[PDB]
Amino acid sequence: ATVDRYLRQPWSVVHGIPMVCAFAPNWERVDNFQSRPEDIVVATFPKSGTTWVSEIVDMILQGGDPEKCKRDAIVNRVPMLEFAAPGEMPTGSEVLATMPSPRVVKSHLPAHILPKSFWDNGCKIIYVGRNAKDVAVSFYHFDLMNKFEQHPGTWDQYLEAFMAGKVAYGSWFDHVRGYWERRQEHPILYLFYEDMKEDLRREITKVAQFLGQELTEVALDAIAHHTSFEAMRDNPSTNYSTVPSHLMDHGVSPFMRKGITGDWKNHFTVAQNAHFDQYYAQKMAGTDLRFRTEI
Numbered sequence: 088a089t090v091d092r093y094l095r096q097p098w099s100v101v102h103g104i105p106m107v108c109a110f111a112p113n114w115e116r117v118d119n120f121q122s123r124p125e126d127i128v129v130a131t132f133p134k135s136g137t138t139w140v141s142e143i144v145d146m147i148l149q150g151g152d153p154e155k156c157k158r159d160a161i162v163n164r165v166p167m168l169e170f171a172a173p174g175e176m177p178t179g180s181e182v183l184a185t186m187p188s189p190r191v192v193k194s195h196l197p198a199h200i201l202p203k204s205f206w207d208n209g210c211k212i213i214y215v216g217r218n219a220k221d222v223a224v225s226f227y228h229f230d231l232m233n234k235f236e237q238h239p240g241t242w243d244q245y246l247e248a249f250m251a252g253k254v255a256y257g258s259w260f261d262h263v264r265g266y267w268e269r270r271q272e273h274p275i276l277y278l279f280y281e282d283m284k285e286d287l288r289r290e291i292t293k294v295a296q297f298l299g300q301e302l303t304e305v306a307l308d309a310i311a312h313h314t315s316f317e318a319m320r321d322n323p324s325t326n327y328s329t330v331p332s333h334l335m336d337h338g339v340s341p342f343m344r345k346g347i348t349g350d351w352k353n354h355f356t357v358a359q360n361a362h363f364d365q366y367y368a369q370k371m372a373g374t375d376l377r378f379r380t381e382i
């Protein structure tokens with residue numbers, strides 16, 4: 088009721104970055120967020136594998152036992168730093184204040200507005216990047232179903248906004264390059280969604296090592312089995328089916344939508360693809376960061 092006036096509103100702006108309308112009021116709760124050195128941040132541009140990696144991390148911290156990951160939904164096990172639903176739920180920052188170390192913190196904030204406390208405390212950041220074409224498709228369908236978002240209109244107009252960095256959380260180009268460069272002065276494990284599709288066990292192993300956790304072969308296989316797309320799609324703890332329909336209309340588009348690399352080929356027109364490829368090449372010249380659009 089009270090949150091309704093924030094839903095389906097145009098983006099607000101915080102520190103020059105487009106922001107979900109409901110999340111933007113009382114930004115100081117974010118700017119002044121009190122982190123701990125043991126915090127683990129799962130940071131992504133939206134729709135790049137946040138939930139996937141969050142479940143992997145929580146599974147690793149539970150020793151590979153899926154029962155401890157079924158006791159609550161992932162939205163509560165891994166709170167989103169900047170989440171807010173004024174008048175209906177506590178903010179993510181308030182929920183995190185009460186959680187025991189090691190806290191797992193999800194965020195989509197670009198590196199330059201991630202709260203300074205994280206950088207000062209050297210907090211381990213696991214960043215996940217995904218190729219921009221698949222991200223755009225996933226984010227468009229997410230905005231169709233998620234009522235916190237401004238309505239995206241048609242796909243062609245959404246794609247123009249995406250390429251120009253007008254969507255919530257800003258420019259994908261700036262986001263992925265910012266955390267790629269920031270690893271110079273901070274402990275960051277920079278993962279690729281496409282690598283995880285190619286060889287999930289290889290990436291789980293890298294996450295475990297970054298976190299200092301040793302996995303038996305049995306625990307590694309258990310985590311890989313429980314973090315397949317099919318498993319996470321059918322798991323009520325990870326598939327977001329417990330979110331009220333007035334916030335996420337799962338009938339419009341499910342959260343666990345397709346889970347592949349290359350769905351952009353089913354949405355980009357021949358013209359859109361050529362135009363996107365030409366712009367992307369200009370915007371990504373001068374970084375060594377590279378993404379795969381097919382595996």
Ligand SMILES: Nc1ncnc2c1ncn2[C@@H]1O[C@H](COP(=O)(O)O)[C@@H](OP(=O)(O)O)[C@H]1O
Nearest residue numbers: 134135136137138225314315316343344345346
């Ligand atoms: N175990 C998994 N394996 C492969 N893809 C997964 C996955 N879990 C979620 N995904 C996909 O990651 C996207 C959600 O990303 P995020 O958690 O950052 O919001 C969605 O992509 P699609 O819309 O392309 O299906 C979701 O289907």
Ligand SMILES: O=[N+]([O-])c1ccc(O)cc1
Nearest residue numbers: 107133137195235236255
């Ligand atoms: O991950 N999330 O829950 C999100 C991501 C993007 C957004 O605009 C709102 C919510």
